[PDB]
Amino acid sequence: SLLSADEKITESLRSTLSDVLPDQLQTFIRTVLQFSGRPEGANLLTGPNTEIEFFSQDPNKNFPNIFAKYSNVLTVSSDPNFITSEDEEVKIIWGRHGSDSLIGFDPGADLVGKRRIDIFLGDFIDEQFNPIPGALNAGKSWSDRFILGDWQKPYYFEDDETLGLNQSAMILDFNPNEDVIQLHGDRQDYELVNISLGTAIFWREKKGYDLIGVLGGVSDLSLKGDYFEFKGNTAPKTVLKTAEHIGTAANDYIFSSTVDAKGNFYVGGGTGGSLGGRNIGARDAWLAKYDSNGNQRWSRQFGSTGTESLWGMASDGSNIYVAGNTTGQLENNTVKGGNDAYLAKYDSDGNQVWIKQNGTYTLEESYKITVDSSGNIYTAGHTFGSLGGPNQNLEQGEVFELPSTDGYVAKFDSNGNQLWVAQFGTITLDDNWGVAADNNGNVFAGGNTKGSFGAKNTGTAGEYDAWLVKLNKDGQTDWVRQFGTPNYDFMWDIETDSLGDIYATGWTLGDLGGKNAGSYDVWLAKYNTNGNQLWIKQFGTSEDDAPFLDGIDIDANDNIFLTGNTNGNLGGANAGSYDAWAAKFDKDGNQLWLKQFGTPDYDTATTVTAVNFGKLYVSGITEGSLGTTNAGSYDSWALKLDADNGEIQDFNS
Ligand SMILES: CCCC[C@@H](F)CCCC[C@H](C)Cc1cc(O)cc(O)c1
Ligand SMILES: CCCC[C@@H](F)CCCC[C@H](C)Cc1cc(O)cc(O)c1
Ligand SMILES: [Ca+2]
Ligand SMILES: [Ca+2]
Ligand SMILES: [Ca+2]
Ligand SMILES: [Ca+2]
Ligand SMILES: [Ca+2]
Ligand SMILES: [Ca+2]
Ligand SMILES: [Ca+2]
Ligand SMILES: [Ca+2]
Ligand SMILES: [Ca+2]
Ligand SMILES: [Ca+2]
Ligand SMILES: [Ca+2]
Ligand SMILES: [Ca+2]
Ligand SMILES: [Cl-]
Ligand SMILES: [Cl-]
Ligand SMILES: [Cl-]
Ligand SMILES: [Cl-]
Ligand SMILES: [Cl-]
Ligand SMILES: [Cl-]
Ligand SMILES: [Cl-]
Ligand SMILES: [Mg+2]
Ligand SMILES: [Mg+2]
Ligand SMILES: [Mg+2]
Ligand SMILES: [Mg+2]
């Protein structure tokens, strides 16, 4: 019976949210929701007003730590939720700019009896909080997809005698003119109920009801509207049987790849399941080795009862170095506070040689790693603390500046001893999205900044620019460069060629290398070792085109390979949703080929690795059945390509 559903839903959500979220965070959320004109959820948070300790050195009070613990803050890009992990009862999933594919509930996790509320914000963009109007993206929004179920099962589904209020999504900014709510089954499986908060979405069967999601501030919807997408009960038909398929019932992601000197191919990333070994808790890191004929030699899974991923991997020719973040305590390590970075070493046989966890009392992220020809290892990332030196934004003065990241690069020897750590940036956000060593002892770093780091930012409202830093063998800066348009420009990865020149790839919403074809476009930029910009190429379709994550590699012939996603017809006719794409360039920026592949469902490449004089590997993630039938939610895939023309080969030979 749906009698008194409004009172039952309000009391249940209020009870759970106010029990789980720290008072500091409730105070922050209530203030933001009131300011933004999305007040519906505020009355669900009944904790007392509490000082928000933006700069506390206590890891348990430091607000960046608290906010990160209960949130997935995504990027200015059109994002899949590449950071989702089943590590908390309540999670705020914030898509920001771009057309985001938002998921928070892993259908493959053991969540029986667990309270689970995912609070979704599809856009809710930074510009709302600008005191001065007129910003390029003020008032702009995108079509976000809120994933509340798939072909396999409804999400947040307790399937018991109650109204199923213990698990539910709450979407705070659903716009039926633009956004989509994805649901299991068909429209006859649901019933919409107008409530004080907005709309309740109930799964309905003979035995009763189960609350799937609440839409704050929207009423009078219809299950016949095109803003609901129903996925039925049957896994997608398989395409691309030539690909290697990696998947469990949980969310599985490849985020990176590399090759050793014998031509063995490695992939790795994060999984909510038991992929390389028995799941330790929430998301774990994992990696796998394949011989050059496509046979898997081993898979390994490691981490903690908290959340970690492999975000980068590189080889010294024999060993495999891996890097990422963790929210827990790794084996043979101590926590520094909040989330930390780590670097680990695996030998060719899959033995974990060591793992080094490093960081500060506050939030570190690390997405990148490189290995030089001497066998030294460099990680890179960003920190809210004072890792390589004092953070540019240390404490609150008379003028409040929101806590913010600086970039860092850390150098290690082959035994994991830290040789140095360099930290740099501006008073505002500076994130790292790239690290690459040359042959002469130097190392480059690259990323995004809201500030004026290597040049005056021309954005009127702190839109991102790209930055590049060259460090010497001792970690001292030789130069800082910055490039961009007045709009957002976002870098994903960098790499050097055999001459020591540095290349970066990203997306732009403006005219960076040329006239923007529409929406996001791809760019590739080249700088010389002395900091001079040589060229920027920009290309795309009228739709959304971008590299993603480990988006560049450079082979021994100085061919450049790029990869990412597109929802246009970039390398061919789009198969549906986003597809993966890859491209090859020469060292002068001439485009040699451009290919597109994927399923009718959401796909993106996440990594590209070229074998010298051998195959090209493009790997990524999918909601479709790529290689074989999807086992649950996100699965992963690797494609073996002819590097001369981008044509897909059978993975196994
Ligand atoms: C469910 C509630 C949503 C809360 C969070 F999910 C996101 C809101 C972030 C607040 C705002 C962006 C920060 C801020 C402060 C400032 O002082 C200057 C700024 O430009 C920007
Ligand atoms: C793995 C993806 C993580 C992406 C993060 F990079 C998101 C940044 C948070 C946004 C924030 C509201 C903007 C902002 C910062 C700032 O330092 C000053 C501001 O006024 C405003
Ligand atoms: Ca986004
Ligand atoms: Ca969005
Ligand atoms: Ca939206
Ligand atoms: Ca439920
Ligand atoms: Ca884990
Ligand atoms: Ca830390
Ligand atoms: Ca900074
Ligand atoms: Ca810019
Ligand atoms: Ca485009
Ligand atoms: Ca790369
Ligand atoms: Ca697709
Ligand atoms: Ca899966
Ligand atoms: Cl971002
Ligand atoms: Cl806005
Ligand atoms: Cl109930
Ligand atoms: Cl209806
Ligand atoms: Cl099939
Ligand atoms: Cl082996
Ligand atoms: Cl600045
Ligand atoms: Mg029920
Ligand atoms: Mg097989
Ligand atoms: Mg390489
Ligand atoms: Mg296959």
Side-chain angles (χ1 to χ4, degrees), residues 1-397 399-653:
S1 175
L2 294 177
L3 191 60
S4 307
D6 173 81
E7 292 44 64
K8 295 150 172 143
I9 292 163
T10 296
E11 286 179 18
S12 176
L13 296 178
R14 173 178 299 145
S15 167
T16 299
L17 292 178
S18 302
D19 188 52
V20 170
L21 300 175
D23 291 341
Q24 276 200 55
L25 182 54
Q26 292 188 40
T27 301
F28 185 80
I29 293 168
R30 285 193 302 259
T31 301
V32 171
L33 290 183
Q34 289 296 343
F35 177 91
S36 64
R38 310 272 183 180
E40 287 79 13
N43 69 90
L44 303 174
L45 308 174
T46 62
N49 281 333
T50 319
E51 193 199 338
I52 306 172
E53 303 188 45
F54 286 106
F55 292 96
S56 176
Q57 312 285 273
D58 180 351
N60 302 310
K61 295 166 154 183
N62 177 263
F63 189 70
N65 287 349
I66 290 169
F67 187 68
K69 178 174 175 62
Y70 298 96
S71 70
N72 290 165
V73 176
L74 297 166
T75 80
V76 189
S77 324
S78 297
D79 303 296
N81 186 359
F82 57 95
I83 56 177
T84 188
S85 182
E86 290 293 334
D87 60 9
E88 299 296 339
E89 295 174 302
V90 178
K91 193 69 57 64
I92 297 165
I93 297 168
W94 185 19
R96 293 168 72 223
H97 318 63
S99 305
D100 304 297
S101 296
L102 298 181
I103 195 178
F105 184 93
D106 188 326
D110 188 349
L111 301 176
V112 180
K114 187 174 186 178
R115 298 187 301 188
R116 288 289 284 100
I117 302 173
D118 289 328
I119 303 170
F120 290 90
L121 291 162
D123 284 317
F124 202 74
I125 66 179
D126 306 17
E127 279 72 7
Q128 291 180 294
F129 309 93
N130 291 348
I132 301 178
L136 281 178
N137 295 276
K140 194 169 180 65
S141 57
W142 287 261
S143 180
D144 305 289
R145 182 164 53 100
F146 301 98
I147 305 170
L148 267 54
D150 56 24
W151 57 266
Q152 194 181 59
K153 67 180 76 178
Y155 293 178
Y156 313 98
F157 182 50
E158 298 120 81
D159 197 9
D160 59 22
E161 58 290 326
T162 78
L163 279 184
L165 306 185
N166 221 45
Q167 301 184 349
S168 186
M170 189 175 354
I171 305 169
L172 300 189
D173 72 327
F174 175 67
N175 184 347
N177 296 334
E178 65 173 23
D179 298 324
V180 166
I181 294 162
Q182 175 177 302
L183 297 169
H184 174 73
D186 59 59
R187 64 169 164 91
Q188 291 89 356
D189 292 322
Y190 297 86
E191 182 170 344
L192 297 184
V193 183
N194 282 342
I195 59 179
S196 63
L197 289 172
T199 296
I201 303 171
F202 277 100
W203 172 269
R204 179 233 272 131
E205 46 181 89
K206 177 175 282 297
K207 55 193 289 291
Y209 298 91
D210 194 295
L211 181 67
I212 304 308
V214 173
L215 314 178
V218 184
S219 299
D220 302 318
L221 298 176
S222 167
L223 291 165
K224 284 168 179 204
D226 292 339
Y227 42 78
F228 285 111
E229 281 180 10
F230 298 93
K231 308 303 290 184
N233 306 84
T234 301
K237 171 183 173 61
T238 303
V239 298
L240 292 177
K241 286 174 172 175
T242 43
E244 166 68 352
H245 171 277
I246 297 173
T248 72
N251 283 313
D252 320 284
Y253 310 88
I254 288 170
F255 296 132
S256 195
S257 60
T258 196
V259 290
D260 66 21
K262 292 167 172 179
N264 299 302
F265 168 62
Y266 301 79
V267 290
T271 177
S274 296
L275 190 170
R278 179 102 305 231
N279 187 272
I280 307 166
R283 183 185 285 195
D284 294 339
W286 71 272
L287 66 152
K289 177 184 182 179
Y290 293 83
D291 65 25
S292 61
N293 285 133
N295 304 294
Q296 192 182 271
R297 300 293 287 178
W298 49 255
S299 66
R300 295 294 183 261
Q301 183 158 326
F302 69 94
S304 75
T305 57
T307 292
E308 50 274 321
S309 306
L310 180 161
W311 293 113
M313 71 210 300
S315 182
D316 62 14
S318 178
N319 306 291
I320 308 292
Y321 292 93
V322 305
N325 73 320
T326 184
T327 70
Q329 184 167 286
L330 299 168
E331 296 287 351
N332 192 44
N333 280 274
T334 65
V335 297
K336 274 63 183 177
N339 297 359
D340 288 340
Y342 76 87
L343 168 66
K345 181 182 186 173
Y346 274 81
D347 71 18
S348 185
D349 293 307
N351 304 315
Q352 192 192 88
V353 186
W354 45 255
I355 186 165
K356 307 294 182 187
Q357 184 166 340
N358 35 79
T360 71
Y361 63 97
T362 181
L363 187 161
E364 277 74 55
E365 287 262 68
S366 177
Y367 287 95
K368 303 291 177 190
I369 186 180
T370 190
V371 175
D372 69 22
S373 62
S374 301
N376 295 316
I377 310 96
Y378 304 78
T379 63
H382 30 275
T383 178
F384 281 81
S386 297
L387 186 62
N391 197 287
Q392 300 292 322
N393 184 19
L394 266 184
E395 55 185 4
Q396 25 196 341
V399 186
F400 180 80
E401 181 69 34
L402 185 75
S404 53
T405 49
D406 283 349
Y408 79 86
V409 173
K411 183 180 186 185
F412 300 84
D413 67 21
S414 68
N415 292 319
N417 299 306
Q418 189 162 282
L419 302 178
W420 49 256
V421 50
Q423 183 168 328
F424 39 76
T426 66
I427 208 188
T428 185
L429 180 157
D430 321 287
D431 291 346
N432 176 267
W433 294 105
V435 71
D438 68 11
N439 293 119
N440 300 312
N442 310 297
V443 64
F444 296 89
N448 301 324
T449 183
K450 288 180 59 61
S452 296
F453 185 23
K456 288 182 190 73
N457 197 319
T458 63
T460 66
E463 291 85 357
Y464 291 6
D465 277 350
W467 59 259
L468 289 168
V469 166
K470 180 184 178 182
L471 308 172
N472 68 17
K473 64 180 179 179
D474 296 322
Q476 300 168 312
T477 58
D478 273 13
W479 47 257
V480 185
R481 290 293 177 266
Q482 177 166 332
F483 57 99
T485 68
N487 208 329
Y488 287 92
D489 322 283
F490 191 112
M491 172 187 315
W492 279 113
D493 196 22
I494 73 183
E495 190 52 80
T496 50
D497 69 12
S498 72
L499 288 314
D501 287 334
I502 184 70
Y503 301 72
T505 191
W507 57 254
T508 183
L509 288 172
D511 298 351
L512 184 60
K515 295 184 177 302
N516 192 291
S519 182
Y520 295 85
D521 273 4
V522 180
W523 57 262
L524 174 64
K526 182 183 186 177
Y527 276 73
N528 70 20
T529 198
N530 289 316
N532 298 68
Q533 185 189 105
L534 301 181
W535 45 261
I536 305 177
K537 295 301 185 179
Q538 176 164 336
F539 70 94
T541 67
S542 58
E543 315 305 308
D544 182 342
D545 329 285
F548 187 59
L549 290 173
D550 184 28
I552 188 168
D553 191 39
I554 302 185
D555 69 18
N557 291 116
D558 294 327
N559 296 303
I560 296 90
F561 300 89
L562 303 185
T563 199
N565 62 71
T566 178
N567 69 0
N569 304 321
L570 182 58
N574 187 283
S577 182
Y578 287 78
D579 286 347
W581 64 268
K584 176 184 187 186
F585 292 81
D586 69 19
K587 64 181 182 163
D588 293 323
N590 296 313
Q591 186 266 89
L592 302 182
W593 56 255
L594 171 58
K595 295 302 280 213
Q596 182 168 332
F597 34 83
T599 75
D601 298 305
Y602 182 86
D603 334 282
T604 183
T606 58
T607 180
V608 56
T609 299
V611 177
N612 295 334
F613 303 96
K615 293 297 182 298
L616 177 70
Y617 293 91
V618 174
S619 309
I621 65 182
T622 186
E623 298 174 29
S625 294
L626 206 165
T628 200
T629 304
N630 188 286
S633 198
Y634 278 78
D635 283 355
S636 293
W637 49 267
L639 280 164
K640 183 177 290 178
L641 270 54
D642 185 324
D644 298 332
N645 56 23
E647 295 180 1
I648 294 169
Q649 313 297 117
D650 206 16
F651 194 86
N652 199 290
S653 60

